[model samples]
Target: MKILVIGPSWVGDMMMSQSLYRTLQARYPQAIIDVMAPAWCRPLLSRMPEVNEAIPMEIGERRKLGHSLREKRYDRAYVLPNSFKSALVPLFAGIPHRTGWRGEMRYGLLNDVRVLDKEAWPLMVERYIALAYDKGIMRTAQDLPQPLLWPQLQVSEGEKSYTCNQFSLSSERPMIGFCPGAEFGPAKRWPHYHYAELAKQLIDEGYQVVLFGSAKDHEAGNEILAALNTEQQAWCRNLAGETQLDQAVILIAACKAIVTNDSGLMHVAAALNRPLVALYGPSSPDFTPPLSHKARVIRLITGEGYHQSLIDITPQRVLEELNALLLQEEA
Candidate 1:
């Protein structure tokens, strides 16, 4: 069987979609699975062994996209996104079976449209996997297969070493990665000073602190670094605006443990199966918690608003949680 999966736009969503890809492969072991997503997601898809190819989606160029997908001659297509544009490629390609939720009145676009029961499937992963199963088989989350499948990204030892050397990072010392920025909004971001305080304690305890983020997070990363004294600053390295997305993945995979905001990196860490401390403020972990046994999620309701809840979570609490994780790993 040949299947084309129209992937999600966000990195975390794309990562979660791997469960859908894995389900298809498990059902049809010989199937060829290809993904149509943004060019930025190509690197991420490459890490998933179940994917046969990652075709970059050309947004807004309907004719070009349709022409390109038509040549693939996919036997089936799983439309992950509900947007009208997301369903167009499969419709234009004349795929025999196009499956997705009945979203945005995508009646003609998707041949096998299923209505979503948000209450039945609370988690995002469950929703993604449900699309891979036959319509009525996944009416509720319990109807889905047991021993839930989680995203696991493959990283070669050579890639890990290369990333460490590129960043002048030492493997001798225990490393704790920090991701302080949330693209969503300030509501999702934890206090920057809290991260600095956590870094100070980790550094004093003989651990190296590595900060990760995109160009947009450089300012936040700097603020955290600035909070540290000269001695503590030497132990911290801010790589927010320095590393590319692919390199960032490799660097993250190399960490012993990581402290991250409820952002894409948190999902990436979970996918890598790294011991992770995920801080949540305005966001509810109930919807999309880190999907790993090695993850610890801390969400506090501090008087109602987004920023308010975040501020209530202090540096001491984070340190204690992180310490407990490290001890668990040692045991």
Candidate 2:
């Protein structure tokens, strides 16, 4: 079967949507899954082997899209994003048998609108995969495990040499990443001071810190970079706004581990199987925890109010987790 998947706009949602695509392919191994999303996610989606084609859909000037999609003649289109706007693509493309969650007056647009039962599956991945199967397809939820895939993108020779030269990273030394931006708000950003303190602790023991974020986090990242001691400070490279989404994946792929907030970058890092120290606040891990190997999630037990800092992720606590992960590395 040939399938077309309408992806979610958010990076994190697009990452988890991979699991849905993976499962669908597993069920019908011969099937081809075509993904439709904005240009931003094209790099990540292109990395998936299951995707037969990655169709970039720009909202304005829909000249090529309708014609291009019509050329493919997909058997069905699974709309993963729950928005009425998302349905327009398949409708314009003349794709029949469109499927998606029912809401926002999409009933007419979607011929196979699925009534989403939020209570049915707690994990977002589970809920997404459940959509691909009918009632008789599965007997129990226990049979389903979170999806996993080896990344399709290779770390280029230049990337390795560049990272080595840029961060003074050693293959012998375990390199970990730090992602401080949440894109949510201060409510989600862990204290920057905690990151600096954590880097210092890791550096003292022997580790490389690759500071990760978009260009928007430059100001915030500078604060964290400033806090580090000179020796340990030089160990943390400011990567905010330095690389594209795909390059970031290659960088994350090279890392031994990463420390991140509940952001889209965290999920992209997870997709590459990089060990993640994902700090959580204003979000629960169960919904979308890092799906990578040996991921450690640190959550604040504090109440709903903002912690007012990423530094709130105490040095002691960060140190404890890093130490524990390092110990696990030995075993």
Candidate 3:
């Protein structure tokens, strides 16, 4: 009934892994699912109800051995990470059934090793879900599972208001969140001037703007704020470096709508079921579209001979989509 999940390092991947966690829950109602990930994932894992507890692997390479893990006597281990080193802990813990993909020649570490057909499972979450089911002839995506279970995150009403109080932001005004930081690189980020223009327009339309990201994204956040006019600046608050992950979650949950790059916060907004406008350029939306009915993604029409840029997706177009999303909600 006890399962140790060696989780992924990235934010979006960790969030998407909830499908596997939930799938395991559906099959084994009594199973206790504990995720072992970096310290940053603590806030995210806390919001997922399917996770029983969080095991902090704060320091990466120079961490302790699994002497304590051996005592827990976990019945199984599901290693989501592809790295050979990530597999060592469960192997040392001596979990009876060690399950994972045929990753990094992890032959000795995994007993129930499944060789994946990359073509069969295109979606990232599908690979995670495959670990929950038995290995069979998955000739196509349909062979594994049909329709993924959407990952959901939860927070209390009090936590939502507390986030607002911390910044003295009024909940009465409709707030539109901007996640301008693309974690991968600047290649994926929409231009800061475009975001600045988007904020000006949104403010003119009587919406409060709040920017969100980690301390790493603070530069982009600053660039965006400086682009705004003096009067427009007052209506918008740059909260990228100021708030922690959990605090970001609460603030995002309180938003009326969100406009973002295809980043972690985009997935967070989708999970929260907030009305969202997700932008795409270099990345394919088909690989990982925002998995929410309320979300609308704006991506370039791909072909052999066509120019594409994130800047081409104008603020006016995003505003129209956001307005459309809001209009549908009221209807």
Candidate 4:
């Protein structure tokens, strides 16, 4: 079977979809599986074994969907992203079978519009992956915790490695990455002062601190930088919004560990198999998590599981988890 999957834009969402890719590949080992994704995600998926092709989806080429799909000639399409816009290409290309959730007014576009039971699939990743199942497979841990595209046994000996020299990352000491910003607004961002304290702790523990985030968070990065202790000030470097997404991936992967908000790059760190600490605020651990035991998650909450945004993630909580994980790694 020749299958084409429309992917999500966010890096984390893309990684989560890899679980579905793995499942699909397992069921149809000889099938031609391809992805239509944003250009930014090409490099990451290029290394995955299951994806046969990465068809770039650009915003300006909305009219070109028909042409794009005709050229690929896919037998079936699995649309993981629920948007009328996402469903356009497959429909125009005249793909016989299109599968996706019932949303975005793409009723005629998808021949198989799966009605999603919101409670049935609590985790966003699992919900996305579940679309690939054909109702025969039992949707449980017995059937799926959603393994990585490359299973633990099949992990490549030579996955891509980051070279800090290319970025003129001027440090030989062990580096720790810090993603201090959250796309979910200030409520989801930990206090800048807290990040600064964490930086101080990492520095005192003899590791260098490298801040990572979008340019919009440069001010927040500066705030964290300023809060660092005098000693940390020497080795702590702020690159928030300075590097592009690809550059950030390389730089972050090079680090021994990363402390980040529940952001997209946290998923990047998971795909890279880097040890990570993902702070949870409003998001639940059952749904979105770093997806690696090496990558621990810290969720601070009130008595109940109320809406605690990223700002609720305190420095002390983050610092404690970082220290514990680092020590555990050594032991």
Candidate 5:
């Protein structure tokens, strides 16, 4: 069997889609799964074992799966995107079994259109997982088979060695990754002071700190650096704007653990199965908590759907979470 999954554009969404890919693989054991994503998103797909191929989808081309996908004749297509534009290609290729949720407008672009109930699938991962199941059988997220598959990304030894040297990184000491960027704005950002404070505490304990995030996070990285003393600063390497998403993934795989804001890299770290402490305030932890057995989330969690101030989450609390995670790992 052959299948095509149109993956999401955002890093967090793309990372979460791995569960969907895994579910598809488990169900159709013999299927060849190809993922068509933007050029930027293709790098991460190489890490997912279930993905058979990564096809680039961009505006520059004549906008055809062209003859390549058409001639290959995929048996089915799973459309992860709800945007009307996303459904266009699956129709172009004429995949017989096209699937997706009811979003925007598809105009008969999909053969199997599932109506998504927002409340039933509040977790974003569940939203993707439900697509892997047939209609009615997977009504709610709970209806999914036991032991819901979460995303797990792998790094080959070659990738690790290359990325380690590419960044001049050392694994002599356990590295603590800091993800201080929140794309959701200042309301979601943990104070840089708290980040530096935690960095100070962790470095004093002999662990090296690596700052991880997009270019947008560079200012926060600098802020964290400014808060540190010269020697403490030396123990931390600010790589916020320095690495692309793929390099960041390899570097993240090298981290012994991570302390992060509610951001895309948080999902990446969780996927790598790193011990993680995810801080939350404005963002709801329940909506998209890190999907890892080793993750700890520190936030004023209110089930009534309210966001508390991020500043109130003290550095000590985060430190305690990290300590708890480390203790568990050691055990």
Candidate 6:
């Protein structure tokens, strides 16, 4: 079977979507799974073992996308996003079964529309995996199947070692990655001073701290670096805007543990099965917590509705969790 999956645009959402890809592949061992996503996400999709191909999805290019899909003759299309435009290509290509949630009144555009009970399927990853089954196969959250597939990203031993050397990273000391930026908003970001304090603690304890994020996070990374003393700064490397998405993935895989805000790299760290301390603020972990059992989530949401909760979580709280995770790793 040839399946076309219209993928999500958000980095974290795209990482979570891999669960659906794995589900489809497990059900049909002979299936050829291809994802249509933003070109920027190609690096990520390339790392998923379940994905057979990555087809670039550019905005305002519906006719071109339709023509391409028509050429491929996909048997089914799993649309991950709610937007009507996300459903356009599959419908235009005349894919027999276009599946997705009953989003944005995408009635005729999708043949297999699954009405989502957000309460029933509280976790976003569960909702994505549910789409892999026949319509109505998942009547309730209780009806959801398991082993409960987790998103797994592939990184070879050679790739990990090579990237480590390329970055001039030390293999002498254990490294902890820090993802301090949230593309969503400040509501989700922990304080830079808090991160700097934690980095100081970690560096003092003889661990290297590596900061990772997109170009948008450069200032935040710099802030954390600036707050650190000269010795601490020497131990922390800020690669916020320096590496490509693929490089970031490999570098993250090289870490012993990662402390991150509720951001894209948090999900990436989880997918890599890295020991992670996921810091949650305005966003609740109930919706999209790291999938790894090795993950430690620290959330302190005081008031309701999109206000800054990062202030409520103390530097000591994150350090306690990080120390516990590292101890567990040693055990």
Backbone N/Cα/C clashes per model: 0, 6, 0, 2, 0, 0
4 or 5: which has the higher lDDT?
5
Local accuracy of candidate 1 as per-residue lDDT tens digits, 1-331? 9999999888788889999888887877698999988887887887789999988755558766776777788999998887987898887777899999988988888889999889998999999988888886778999888777888887889999988999988777878999998878888988888899889999988998999988889998999999999988888999998986678889888888899888888899999988999998877887778999999988876321248788889889999999899888879
Tens-digit lDDT track for model 6 on 38-123? 78889888888888999865555786768767989999999999998789899888899999998998899898898888888888
Better of 3 and 4 by TM-score: 3
Model 1 ranges off by over 4 Å: 58-60, 302-306
Candidate 5 lDDT over 1-331, as tens digits, reads 8998989888888899999888887887697999999887877887788889998766334255544578879999988877887887877787888998878766487878888788999899998888888886987888889788999988777887888789877767778899988877777778888899999999998899999987888888998899989988878988998987888899988887898888888999999988999888866777778998888887785542223567888888888888888878778
- Which parts of model 6 are misplaced by more than 4 Å? 58-60, 302-308
Better candidate by lDDT, 1 or 3: 1
Relative to the unseen true structure, what is the C-alpha lDDT of residue 161 in candidate 1, on a scale of 0 to 100?
A: 93
Better of 1 and 4 by lDDT: 1
The positional error of residue 308 in candidate 6, measured at the CA in angstroms, is: 5.8
Q: Once model 2 is optimally superposed onto the true structure by TM-score, how far is the C-alpha of residue 243 displaced, in angstroms?
A: 1.2
Error of 5 at 111 (Å): 1.7
- Candidate 2 vs candidate 4: the lDDT winner is 2
How many steric clashes does model 4 contain? 2
lDDT of 4 by residue, 94-181 (tens): 7899988777867888888877666666667666666666754545434554453431112322222334665556666788898877
TM-score of each: 0.94, 0.86, 0.94, 0.84, 0.92, 0.94
What are the C-alpha RMSDs, in order, of all predicted structures?
2.1, 3.3, 2.8, 3.9, 2.9, 2.2
Residue 9's lDDT within candidate 1 is 87
Q: What is the lDDT of residue 198 in candidate 4?
A: 78
lDDT, candidates in the order shown: 0.87, 0.74, 0.84, 0.73, 0.84, 0.87
lDDT of 3 at 169: 93
Off by over 4 Å in 5: 58-63, 66-68, 156-162, 301-308
